[PDB]
């Protein structure tokens, strides 16, 4: 009748919030960039060629773009991915010798590069090698007459050379839960990063992102929907780095317009070096071109959602970064196997109140790098034969603001950020983990026989 009981049902739609280990998926056409494992695909299960998505209703959960621990694991996944894609290849310890460097072989009209000589060990052990190479002003530093340089990392740590096949342009991948776990997606348009998410779906496998090592900007990824996104961790804390998700895509086309030459250098036994050969012909510096129409509207679209985040009547200013390291002052990103660093001054430069051709930015060609703050490992990116180009939908942004100032009168906004964890927050705001608990319980009025 009415005195309640305990009744068991198995397979109930019930789960718990807990964090654990997923497993990779990566489509089957993305399986085809290879280069002896670009990133990590080996025995990895290819994405279910149609990752079934099951729409849910009457389902609520708190998502977070800050304490999310899928940012936590991802930030050290890509570190060791990078580490293990490096640790069986060639050491360059004999390359920490003083390099004779001098203004590069040109007819002046300055150059930025230098024509630099040194000795080196060949196949035989007792005989050495006279050979010269070309480095950028960031690859070398003047340790102390013609200016004398060392490899800038000798003062710090030991280095490595990559196996030249590895293609570094980011590659699409999916994410699947094994059984006993599921994945939830927060399919909403105005999500303030804290509180209840409005729309949840579940999958065994997710979408496709690209590991874009981009400070400041975000590209190659996921655009916003309708009105341009103005997200914050907590809209009253300037020490937290601030993230943006564009709606309109701004089309980029970075290029290193120098038909590059690669040198075969025997420095074994077995070991080799790929030196920067002679640049083929006319001399141009790497850069990135951007369309003017889509940028002019990313101004007005973003702007009017900021007077919705502070004051309907005020003055808003933008300026570039005053100083730090090139990752945060310039745009840091790999373009074709090497890293570009474009002076971001022409952008962060505007003033806003209440109410056919192209442009570009100058980018420095950097080959050696000590990224991921993996204290102990810097390395050299092998030269890239041929002219480089790389395009992408510009998608996101990292920036900051000033302080108290003259209140309501004006305020400044500048670039920076850097820490690759807030870049992973540009896609992880909409993903969290669940575990399935099929054994529910309920008090009906029934009982089992003796």
């Amino acid at each position: 009748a009415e005195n309640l009981w305990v009744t068991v049902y198995y397979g109930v739609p019930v789960w718990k919030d807990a964090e654990t280990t997923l497993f990779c998926a990566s489509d089957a056409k993305a399986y085809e960039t290879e280069k002896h494992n670009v990133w990590a695909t080996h025995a990895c299960v290819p994405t279910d060629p149609n990752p079934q998505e099951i729409h849910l209703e009457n389902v609520t959960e708190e998502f977070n773009m800050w304490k999310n621990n899928m940012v936590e694991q991802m930030h050290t996944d890509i570190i060791s991915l990078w580490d293990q894609s490096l640790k069986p290849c060639v050491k360059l310890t004999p390359l920490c010798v003083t390099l004779q460097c001098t203004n590069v072989t040109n007819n002046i009209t300055d150059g930025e590069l230098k024509n630099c000589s040194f000795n080196m060990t060949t196949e035989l052990r007792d005989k050495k090698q006279k050979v010269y190479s070309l480095f950028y002003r960031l690859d070398v530093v003047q340790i102390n007459s013609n200016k004398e340089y060392r490899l800038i990392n000798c003062n710090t740590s030991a280095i490595t050379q990559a196996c030249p096949k590895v293609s570094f342009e980011p590659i699409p991948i999916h994410y699947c839960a094994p059984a006993g776990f599921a994945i939830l997606k927060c399919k909403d348009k105005k999500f303030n990063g804290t509180g209840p998410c409005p729309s949840v779906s579940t999958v065994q496998c997710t979408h496709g992102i690209k590991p874009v090592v981009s400070t400041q900007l975000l590209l190659n990824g996921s655009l916003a929907e309708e009105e341009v996104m103005i997200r914050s961790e907590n809209i009253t804390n300037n020490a937290k780095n601030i993230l943006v998700q564009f709606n309109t895509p701004v089309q980029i086309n970075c290029t290193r317009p120098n038909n590059n030459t690669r040198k075969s250098i025997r420095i074994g036994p077995g070991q080799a070096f790929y030196a920067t050969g002679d640049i083929i012909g006319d001399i141009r510096q790497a850069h990135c071109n951007v369309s003017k129409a889509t940028w002019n509207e990313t101004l007005g679209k973003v702007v009017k959602q900021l007077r919705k985040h502070f004051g309907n009547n005020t003055i808003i200013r933008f300026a570039n970064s005053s100083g730090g390291d090139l990752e945060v002052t310039t745009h840091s990103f790999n373009c074709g196997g090497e890293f570009f660093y474009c002076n971001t001054s022409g952008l962060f430069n505007s003033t806003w109140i209440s109410n056919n051709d192209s442009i570009t930015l100058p980018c420095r060609i950097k080959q050696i790098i000590n990224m991921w703050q993996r204290i102990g490992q810097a390395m050299y990116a092998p030269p890239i034969q041929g002219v480089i180009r790389c395009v992408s939908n510009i998608t996101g942004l990292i920036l900051t603001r000033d302080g108290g100032s003259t209140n309501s009168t004006t305020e400044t906004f500048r670039p920076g950020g850097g820490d690759m964890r807030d870049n992973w927050r540009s896609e992880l705001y909409k993903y969290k983990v669940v575990k399935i608990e099929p054994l529910g319980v309920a008090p009906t009025r029934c009982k089992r026989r003796v």
Binding site: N58, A182, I436
Partner: protein, 126 residues
């Protein structure tokens, strides 16, 4: 009505004890880097086995539906049955057990089948 796996996550418990089997499909769904999946399918049985052992000892043995002989002693979340199975979903009511769900099961495996499976050979000695 058949609206897929976990399709009834937040509707009436009566309409939620329907799909008891689709959620009983993806509890098992079937060098290095191979480590990324081998430690993942290891935790598929871990979400199943926990309930295979619990239901086995009980009067469930099998899965899906399973009546039990535990009085919901009114000190627990005493509610009207309509305030359980008619006005609530799985989420809204498994919320209510949480205050006492650590107390309910000093019984199902500990006071039921510990004793209700040893009068099966004091009776069955005829």
């Amino acid at each position: 009505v058949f609206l897929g796996f976990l399709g009834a996550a937040g509707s009436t418990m009566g309409a939620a004890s329907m799909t008891l089997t689709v959620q009983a499909r993806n509890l098992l769904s079937g060098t290095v880097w191979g480590i990324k999946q081998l430690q993942a399918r290891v935790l598929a049985v871990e979400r199943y086995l926990r309930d295979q052992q619990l239901l086995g000892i009980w009067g469930c043995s099998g899965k899906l539906i399973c009546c039990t002989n535990v009085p919901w002693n009114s000190s627990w979340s005493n509610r009207n049955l309509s305030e359980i199975w008619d006005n609530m979903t799985w989420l809204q009511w498994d919320k209510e057990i949480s205050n006492y769900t650590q107390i309910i099961y000093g019984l199902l495996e500990e006071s039921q089948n510990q004793q209700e499976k040893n009068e099966q050979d004091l009776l069955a000695l005829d």
